[PDB]
Design an enzyme around this catalytic site. Structure first.
Site, PDB file in Angstrom:
ATOM      1  N   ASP A   1      26.991  29.104 -56.066  1.00  0.00           N
ATOM      2  CA  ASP A   1      26.029  28.027 -56.110  1.00  0.00           C
ATOM      3  C   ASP A   1      24.672  28.238 -55.395  1.00  0.00           C
ATOM      4  OD1 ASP A   1      25.075  25.472 -56.399  1.00  0.00           O
ATOM      5  OD2 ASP A   1      26.720  24.598 -55.422  1.00  0.00           O
TER       6      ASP A   1
ATOM      7  N   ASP B   1      19.027  27.145 -59.963  1.00  0.00           N
ATOM      8  CA  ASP B   1      20.425  26.551 -59.845  1.00  0.00           C
ATOM      9  C   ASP B   1      21.782  27.143 -60.639  1.00  0.00           C
ATOM     10  OD1 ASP B   1      22.654  25.225 -58.297  1.00  0.00           O
ATOM     11  OD2 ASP B   1      22.082  23.275 -58.982  1.00  0.00           O
TER      12      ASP B   1
END
Ligand SMILES: CN1C(=N)N[C@](c2ccccc2)(c2cccc(-c3cccnc3)c2)C1=O
EC number: 3.4.23.46
Length: 390
Positions: free
Chosen positions: A36, A232
């Site tokens: 992440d 992201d």
């Protein structure tokens, strides 16, 4: 390719996330961990949950250290809560090092774990500024660099299959690579182009121009980065600020106007299906995002195909049709270059040089007529004005 031990160490897909194997504690406890770049905590399931078949058992780790502090992480569509501590952490298909890192032991959560995702925790790779509860909780990558000789850089190749993967296939398939401490040349073609990291919190960048099939969206460039633009791997879609989303969807509809799609399709809610092998890729436009370059008044562009922005999904009737969901959606928190965008490129998170690199991925899905691209340079003026300030 100089990092063979780390090549092909990821599994997963855009909709459920890409994960890497990690071990925590002594003796080591193996867990699958979501990669992440949009958060900064290393947080693992540490209590039974219906969607977890394993979790971190602190009482079985001789090296577990309790920090005696709770952490509460509420977010848009859910939350996670847990207890802070430290333990010895390794990445089996990674650098050959063991580090002492902070671990948030998740004891309670709501809409955090995903059924069938195969991951039991998350590796927040962004900066301390956004770590929870505060910036004093050192992120995993900061610990790794401080304790070892690992260079302050990582790179990600997320590989979308281009078609649906069932439960068995997704466990047996290679989802991509996370190269810790380096750049592996086998993962990309052509040149790497770098954009500055605007500020070290999220991996923030500046978009300076947007085109749909070469046609300039013609919006004030500040709109594209309102209130920020980030890279992201923990977001599935390409997410755009409301006004940008509305302008981009109108232009994508106009380019694909030979076929009419329902409103539910453009809202990213409903799938569209075509008879096996007949997806009309050519009617959908390519999308180019121009990013600020490392040289004054210079930019470069990254171009993605509908093969990246149409996410393969299995039909409700498990038919032989090829089905997809539109993977571009609106945001009220700025642009998010999510997994469907990252799937087109090899992405270098050069923390040491405060820059992010993009190159065409060796695993991007394309057709015989078009490919994703990373090209430059382009003369671009007043790019500093494209960034948003509160
Ligand atoms: C947008 N985003 C993210 N980049 N990581 C998540 C998050 C991380 C820490 C705290 C709160 C949220 C996240 C959490 C869990 C799962 C996923 C997730 C879900 C689906 C596909 N890929 C990743 C993302 C999240 O919501």
């Amino acid at each position: 390719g100089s990092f063979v031990e780390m090549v092909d160490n990821l599994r997963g897909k855009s909709g459920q996330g890409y994960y890497v194997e990690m071990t925590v504690g002594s003796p080591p406890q193996t867990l699958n961990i979501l990669v992440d770049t949009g958060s900064s905590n290393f947080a693992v399931g540490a209590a039974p949950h219906p969607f977890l078949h394993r979790y971190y058992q602190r009482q079985l780790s001789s090296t577990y250290r309790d920090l005696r502090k709770g952490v509460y992480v509420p977010y848009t569509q859910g939350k996670w809560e847990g207890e802070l501590g430290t333990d010895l952490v390794s990445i089996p298909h990674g650098p050959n090092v063991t580090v002492r890192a902070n671990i948030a032991a998740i004891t309670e959560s709501d809409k955090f774990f995903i059924n069938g995702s195969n991951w039991e925790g998350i590796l927040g790779l962004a900066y301390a500024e956004i770590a929870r509860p505060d910036d004093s909780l050192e992120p995993f990558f900061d610990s790794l660099v401080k304790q070892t000789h690992v260079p302050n850089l990582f790179s990600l190749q997320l590989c979308g299959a281009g078609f649906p993967l069932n439960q068995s296939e997704v466990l047996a398939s290679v989802g991509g690579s996370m190269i810790i401490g380096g750049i592996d040349h086998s993962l990309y073609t052509g040149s790497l182009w770098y954009t500055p990291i605007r500020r070290e919190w999220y991996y923030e960048v500046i978009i300076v121009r947007v085109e749909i099939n070469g046609q300039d969206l013609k919006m004030d460039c500040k709109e594209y980065n309102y209130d920020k633009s980030i890279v992201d791997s923990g977001t599935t879609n390409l997410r755009l600020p409301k006004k940008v989303f509305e302008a981009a969807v109108k232009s994508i509809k106009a380019a694909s106007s030979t076929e009419k799609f329902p409103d539910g399709f453009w809202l990213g809610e409903q799938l569209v299906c075509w008879q096996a092998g007949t997806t009309p890729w050519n009617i959908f436009p390519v999308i180019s995002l121009y990013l600020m370059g490392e040289v004054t008044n210079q930019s470069f562009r990254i171009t993605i195909l509908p093969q990246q922005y149409l996410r393969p999904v299995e039909d409700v009737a498990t038919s032989q049709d090829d089905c997809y969901k539109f993977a571009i959606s609106q945001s009220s928190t700025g642009t998010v270059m999510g997994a469907v965008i990252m799937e087109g490129f090899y992405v270098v998170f050069d923390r040491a040089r405060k820059r992010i690199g993009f190159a065409v991925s060796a695993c991007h899905v394309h057709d015989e007529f078009r490919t994703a691209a990373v090209e430059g340079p382009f003369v671009t003026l007043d790019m500093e004005d494209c960034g948003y300030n509160i």
